[PDB]
Design a protein around this ligand. Sequence first.
Ligand SMILES: OC[C@H]1O[C@H](O[C@H]2[C@H](O)[C@@H](O)[C@@H](O[C@H]3[C@H](O)[C@@H](O)[C@@H](O[C@H]4[C@H](O)[C@@H](O)[C@@H](O)O[C@@H]4CO)O[C@@H]3CO)O[C@@H]2CO)[C@H](O)[C@@H](O)[C@@H]1O
Ligand SMILES: [Ca+2]
Ligand SMILES: [Ca+2]
Length: 418
Amino acid sequence: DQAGKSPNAVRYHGGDEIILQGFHWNVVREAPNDWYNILRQQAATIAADGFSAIWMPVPWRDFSSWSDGSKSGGGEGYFWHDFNKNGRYGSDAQLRQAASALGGAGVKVLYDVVPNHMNRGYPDKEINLPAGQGFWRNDCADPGNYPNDCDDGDRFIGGDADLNTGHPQVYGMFRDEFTNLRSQYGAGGFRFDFVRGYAPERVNSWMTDSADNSFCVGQLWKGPSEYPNWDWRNTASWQQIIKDWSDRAKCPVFDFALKERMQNGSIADWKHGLNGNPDPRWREVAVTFVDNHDTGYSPGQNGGQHHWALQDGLIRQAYAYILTSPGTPVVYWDHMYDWGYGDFIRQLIQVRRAAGVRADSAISFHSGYSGLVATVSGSQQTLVVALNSDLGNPGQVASGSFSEAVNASNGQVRVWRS
Ligand SMILES: OC[C@H]1O[C@H](O[C@H]2[C@H](O)[C@@H](O)[C@@H](O[C@H]3[C@H](O)[C@@H](O)[C@@H](O[C@H]4[C@H](O)[C@@H](O)[C@@H](O)O[C@@H]4CO)O[C@@H]3CO)O[C@@H]2CO)[C@H](O)[C@@H](O)[C@@H]1O
Ligand SMILES: [Ca+2]
Ligand SMILES: [Ca+2]
């Protein structure tokens, strides 16, 4: 588990991370004020299960609230009112103990940070940016969901809570908080939220200033069709759009190309995610996932958000895929500890580890069989992966002696290793 930036100075922190998304959407409602306490107690098991990092929820307190139709929400962290750590997940003191316990067990803690907007309208907060000083996107004329003079990116919904991240004083505010998270809360890196709401270069700057050598990941969720007609991106692939962001922020990016293929393509089409790209410079910057707090289910109310959920009969296949392939994989809290995929994932993580699969490992796709058949070249062993495939045996696609590593779902999930 080394460190170092990629050959392109991209902050993938050694290319051998295995991340646990340390929360689900309904945590504030299912274990109110008690999440840091649970993470603290489970620190030893997370480390033993094989994760080298954990994506923690937004540490900034959120007392927001909404009701839309028959749904309600708030306090999850994405509509924060100040940097005070005494929120819905637990107290400042409890966060410090969780971070320490996690760090102590060998799991780097990555905080989710939301620079785009804040709960501008909350009455009792410690940050008060008055209007008319250029601190807000809406301090400038705001025609549409396009960059204006006060906000160099898209806006969140109405844009009325969007910050001018480029304003010297705002940039500085975030900068110092990132430094704070790092030296007082054990930050080993950050997950940048809603990266489409502000310039990618600003992310590069923040990291340069506070955590140059840490890990970073940006959440860019914007399809080709969201860009203007005359924009090069309007007719670009999902890979291109996200690679472009990663080149500019110098941070790994969530593989929405893969997610898109998982949702709308067939299993054989998964070789079209950013992680399957034949150029190591492209692959190695992908941060793969099966579902997250937005896309997937969560225990509790409404089944969570489930905006782009994976078909239930592909969950094991999806995990065998991300866990044996290039890019940096992210495991969803619930699959691991709530829905019983624990044993299955532990297995795959051990296979990834023994094989020495890393972010830039080579992967080749075989086309003469049904499903997905891939040969992954780990630094230690070669993996042959067959998902929902009629492949007979590894020898049909690769030379050398093979031993079965995994065999689940009726032969639907098969992995062999040299
Ligand atoms: O003042 C600004 C706006 O305030 C009001 O907006 C509401 C939305 O209507 C609610 O739906 C909600 O927003 C959630 C959102 O549903 C939820 O998915 C989550 O969003 C994140 C996402 O998880 C994350 O991964 C990321 O990439 O981006 C999203 C934004 O960070 O969190 C949102 C915020 O809690 O709450 C807001 C604010 O309460 C109002 O309806 C709008 O008119 C108005 O402009
Ligand atoms: Ca590392
Ligand atoms: Ca914005």
